[PDB]
Amino acid sequence: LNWISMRSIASSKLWMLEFSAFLERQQDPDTYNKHLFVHISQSSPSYSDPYLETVDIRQIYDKFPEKKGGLKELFERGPSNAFFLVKFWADLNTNIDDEGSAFYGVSSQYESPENMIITCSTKVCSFGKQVVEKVETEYARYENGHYLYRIHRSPLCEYMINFIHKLKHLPEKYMMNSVLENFTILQVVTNRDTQETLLCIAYVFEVSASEHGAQHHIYRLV
Amino acid sequence: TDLEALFNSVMNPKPSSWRKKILPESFFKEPD
């Protein structure tokens, strides 16, 4: 698990296989629409692959929570190899919410060498301060010599959908990125029994320049 | 009666500005 933590989102103990945020509507009995705002699917890294580019963590303290229980505190305390920062270029081009209500949810997959119980805390942050915080506890399954966990079709909270709504109903893309400048999410994955921090990902956003598709870049905090 | 918005801008200090931070160049260049 350590050769991957230089090239993927993974610590010595947990590795995130996939991440997805999306909107889905069932147009027909046999037809359905799924649009992905953001997506990551790095489940087959290789030793040949280049290392991720490092980012100084001190630089990003402002856009994420501070004071007690915040990022400095965590990073200072938790295992260093577990901190990652991700920038997303969202793809907001979808119509599935015009009529016939859709479904908005997020999903992720993780892998572990060890069997554990993991607690995932996700916080949305406006101007650094915290607005909403969701917590989920996920349990393991043995597969292929290792352990697997997941957040499956988690329902996006109302605040979230609203935010997207206002954002999507906007005239120009820069007015979008501008708003996105001050919105960030911090997700921390902990080992419930022992309380160690296995993964800490900080998310920052921008909207895609391209007509279609989303993109991302991953950095390793230091 | 929500002319108040006009005020947020002179009242309400500005954010830290991402672009002025020390980061890798690739941070602002969306990929293909």
Numbering used by the authors:
A (entry chain A): 204 to 425
B (entry chain E): 26 to 57
Publication text:
Mammalian homologues of the proteins in the Hippo pathway have been characterized and grouped into three components: the upstream regulatory factors involved in cell-to-cell signaling (FRMD6, NF2), the kinase core (MST, WW45, LATS, MOB1), and the downstream transcriptional machinery (YAP, TAZ, TEAD), which leads to the expression of genes involved in cell proliferation and anti-apoptosis. Being unable to enter the nucleus upon activation of the core kinases, YAP and TAZ, both of which are transcription co-activators, are not able to bind to the transcription factor TEAD to promote transcription of genes involved in cell proliferation and anti-apoptosis. Formation of the YAP/TAZ-TEAD complex within the nucleus leads to transcription of growth-promoting and pro-survival genes, thus promoting malignancy. Herein, we report the crystal structure of mouse TAZ-TEAD4 complex, which reveals a distinct binding mode not observed in YAP-TEAD complex.
We have solved the crystal structure of the mouse TAZ-TEAD4 complex to a resolution of 2.9 Å. The TAZ-TEAD complex crystallizes with four molecules of TAZ and four molecules of TEAD in the asymmetric unit. All four molecules of TEAD adopt a globular structure similar to that seen in the previously solved YAP-TEAD structures. The structures of all four molecules of TAZ reveal two short helices with a short loop of 13 residues in between. Further analysis reveals two different binding modes of the TAZ-TEAD complex within the asymmetric unit. The binding interfaces for helix α1 and helix α2 of TAZ and YAP to TEAD are virtually identical. The only difference lies in the position of the loop between helix α1 and helix α2. As the loop of TAZ is shorter than that of YAP, it adopts a downward position, while that of YAP is in an upward position. In the second binding mode, we observe two TAZ molecules straddling two TEAD molecules in a heterotetramer conformation. The two TEAD molecules are related by a two-fold symmetry and the two TAZ molecules criss-cross each other to bring the two TEAD molecules together. This conformation is achieved by the binding of TAZ helix α1 to one TEAD molecule and the binding of helix α2 of the same TAZ to a second TEAD. Instead, the loops of the two TAZ molecules cross each other in this conformation and a hydrogen bond is observed between Asn33 of each of the TAZ molecules.
